[PDB]
Design a protein around this ligand. Structure first.
Ligand code: APC
Ligand code: MG
Ligand code: MG
Length: 232
């Protein structure tokens, strides 16, 4: 049956087989859940320090590449730059912190980002009760949860050399999920995606982001760059 030209629907290629992603749900350790509730539902004047804690974590993960090379030189063969990118998306109201540090395995996500008690958590909650500045979070070993000063939901996508790529996600409320992530491979590192609360959109503005990186994160020790989407 001769054809000289086909329409797009006709030559659309069949989909790749659908992938399964395994999902597991976990409760936050009790004091972690308590802290998150405190962080979310209390007014703090100096919420901007969230970005200091996430940059700090990225800088730690990047220093680990430098040091893991002493026990495993193969990391020296990576051509990836050691760096951080800050990516505001005003369309989606997200602020993403991307690094090319060592990343986390599945068990790292579960054990490091919620099910294990930090020994400073109770002390920190008491300090906050007695009126401490929220900036003190960074000294009590629970700085990641400062994301929820500004974010209603946090997704962390991560890939470590020793595991597959995973997504951790929580809207607080007492639990989080970890799921195998078969989507856009991110390569080694971690991306924290902050789904900002409606009153916190200043952290999508490039002037605001530059201001708080200069104020609080001037010794990262790696290049950080801010991607600014061109105004249409
Ligand atoms: N960008 C990232 N890359 C890799 N691991 C990360 C990460 N962000 C967070 N983590 C993991 O999450 C853990 C919890 O981080 P935080 O709540 O900041 C306490 P910490 O950073 O371990 O101590 P510190 O903040 O006192 O230096 C880290 O120890 C690390 O294992
Ligand atoms: Mg169709
Ligand atoms: Mg930290």
């Amino acid at each position: 049956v001769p054809r000289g030209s086909h329409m797009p629907e006709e030559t659309q290629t069949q989909d790749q087989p659908m992938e399964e992603e395994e999902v597991e749900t976990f409760a936050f350790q009790a004091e972690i859940a308590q802290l998150m509730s405190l962080i979310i539902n209390t007014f703090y004047s100096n919420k901007e320090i969230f970005l200091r804690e996430l940059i700090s974590n990225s800088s730690d993960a990047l220093d680990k590449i430098r040091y893991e090379s002493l026990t495993d030189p193969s990391k020296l063969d990576s051509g990836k730059e050691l760096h951080i990118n800050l990516i505001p998306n005003k369309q989606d109201r997200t602020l993403t912190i991307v690094d090319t540090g060592i990343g986390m395995t599945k068990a790292d996500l579960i054990n490091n980002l919620g099910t294990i008690a930090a020994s400073g958590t109770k002390a920190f909650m008491e300090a906050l009760q007695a009126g401490a500045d929220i900036s003190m979070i960074g000294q009590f070993g629970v700085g990641f949860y400062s994301a929820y000063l500004v974010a209603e939901k946090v997704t962390v996508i991560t890939k470590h050399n020793d595991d597959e790529q995973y997504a951790w996600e929580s809207s607080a409320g007492g639990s989080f999920t970890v799921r195998t992530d078969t989507g856009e491979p991110m390569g080694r590192g971690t991306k924290v995606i902050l789904h900002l609360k409606e009153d916190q959109t200043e952290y999508l503005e490039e002037r605001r982001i530059k201001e708080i990186v200069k104020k609080h994160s001037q010794f990262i020790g790696y290049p950080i760059t801010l991607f600014v989407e061109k105004e249409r």
